[PDB]
């Protein structure tokens, strides 16, 4: 019925339904799928504000909530929320349908609260042909979630900056978002052979391009293998698209941001580096390279406010 219809125009709706079909990865219950992971400790993103703004073009990210904060900073065109912990891809399967329902920034936090909770669970149940799988999800994740949107308002209140969930215009442009299909959350591994990949050939069979890929601090738990490699060396990226990473160690040559301490005791220092210098990076064959020897060789240190450019190259050994 095209009354439903809800994308402004046939390419739209076209470039959505090709998003949606991007290959995915078999995802199977481990230990990670607990309430906490569901939800960032990274209390600076802030940090990221003059780097990411406008930078547009499609969002890739793993993680939940703080990826809509960076994409509508970025005023990103597509988002795809891609993790390999089933709890985290239905969390966020959650987020964006109290995003469509939810007119202001004040209702999509009452969902997730206390306050909306009895609301929130019918509103799943009505949603879904098997809505337990989501309420047993909405039942673990959102404690979580509640604290952590707390201490989002406090932040953005303490470090005087707008995101999507204390602003109405970045609220309103997630939301939107939402509504037309374009916040994808996808079933993938880094480390995988299908997703990632994937996600580049999408993106260059229908002629776009990544903006911005966010890893979190993921990368703290691998030296990058084959899979990774190839799968970044294939996204088309424009001249501007930056990596988005956090680190943990070596803080003294990486600080940790101020107010770093609110929601986690290990870490965060914030690393920009252009998904371009990231692919030469990639690219060269250093045995054993980690995103720290990356930031050690390449990363430019704001060493007061916690966060570094890697705007420098490999050198050959
Ligand atoms: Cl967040």
């Known amino acids: 019925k095209i009354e439903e219809n809800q994308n402004v125009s046939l390419n739209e709706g076209d470039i959505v339904s090709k998003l949606k079909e991007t290959p995915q990865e078999t995802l199977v219950p481990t230990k990670w799928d607990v309430g906490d992971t569901t939800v960032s400790n990274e209390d600076r993103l802030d940090l990221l504000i003059p780097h990411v703004q406008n930078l547009g073009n499609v969002y890739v990210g793993v993680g939940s909530e703080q990826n809509l904060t960076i994409a509508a900073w970025a005023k990103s065109d597509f988002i795809y929320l891609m993790d390999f912990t089933q709890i985290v891809v239905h969390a966020n399967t959650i987020t964006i349908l109290f995003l469509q329902k939810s007119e202001k920034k004040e209702d999509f936090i009452r ?23 989501y309420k047993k999800v909405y039942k673990q994740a959102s404690p979580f979630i509640r604290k952590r949107h707390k201490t989002n308002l406090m932040l953005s209140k303490k470090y005087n900056y707008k995101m999507f969930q204390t602003d109405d215009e970045q609220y309103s442009y997630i939301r939107k978002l939402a509504i037309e299909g374009k916040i994808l959350p996808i079933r993938g591994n880094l480390l995988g052979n299908i997703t990632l990949t994937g996600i580049g050939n999408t993106l260059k069979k229908i002629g776009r391009k990544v903006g911005i890929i966010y890893f979190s601090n993921a990368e703290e738990y ?35 941001s101020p107010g770093s301490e609110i929601s986690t005791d290990r870490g965060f220092h914030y690393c920009v580096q252009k998904i371009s210098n990231f692919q030469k990076w990639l690219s060269s064959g250093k045995p054993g390279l980690r995103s720290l020897q990356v930031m050690v060789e390449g990363g430019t240190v704001d060493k007061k406010n916690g966060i570094t450019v890697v705007d420098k190259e490999p050198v050959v050994t």
């Open 111 to 133: 969902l997730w609260g206390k306050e909306g909770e009895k609301e929130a669970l019918e509103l799943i149940q009505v949603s879904f042909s098997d809505p337990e799988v």
């Open 222 to 256: 691998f030296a990058y293998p084959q899979e990774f490699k190839n799968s970044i060396l294939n996204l088309p990226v424009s001249e501007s698209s930056l990596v988005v990473r956090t680190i943990s160690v070596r803080k003294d040559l990486f600080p940790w």
